[PDB]
């Protein structure tokens, strides 16, 4: 990756840039399908802020296959413990499936962090759970 170098500089303001950058790369380095996306919005009484997020299609293994589920989540600095913001990005030709793990707008339900928080689970472990669950239960199946 060539953007990795620029990625670190893209933040330079996180609580743990090092621990954040390493975690990010580790996720993409293991999946090879995900990629860190940049973003920025206003918050402090209306003031844009640098906030990185994850993007890309994650490999979802089926009974005997493996598709590429689209997802995107905001990577917080380190509060309360991990990024709670999690939603799926369905394409115009995709079809979102309602369930305990999905409402309808692609947003992920369930406490997740509020339930476990051992912590035990890390940045890589987080998506791992979604990958495990989404591995059997189709969150958003597209048309053939």
């Amino acid at each position: 990756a060539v953007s990795e170098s620029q990625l670190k500089k893209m933040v330079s303001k996180y609580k743990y840039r090092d621990l954040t950058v390493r975690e990010t790369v580790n996720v993409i380095t293991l999946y090879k399908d995900l990629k860190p996306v940049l973003d920025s919005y206003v918050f402090n009484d209306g003031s844009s802020r640098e906030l990185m997020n994850l993007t890309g299609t994650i490999p979802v293994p089926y009974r005997g296959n493996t598709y590429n589920i689209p997802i995107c989540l905001w990577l917080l600095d380190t509060y309360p413990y991990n990024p709670p913001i999690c939603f799926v990005k369905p394409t115009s030709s995709m079809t979102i499936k309602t369930g305990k793990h999905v409402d309808a707008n692609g947003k992920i339900y369930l406490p997740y962090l509020h339930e476990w928080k051992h912590p035990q689970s890390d940045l890589l472990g987080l998506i791992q759970v979604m990958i495990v669950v989404f591995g059997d239960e189709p969150p958003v199946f597209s048309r053939p």
Binding site: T57, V60, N68, M94
Partner: peptide, 9 residues
């Protein structure tokens, strides 16, 4: 690769 997502019913 593309997204598309896994099939279903």
């Amino acid at each position: 690769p593309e997204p598309t997502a896994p099939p279903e019913e």
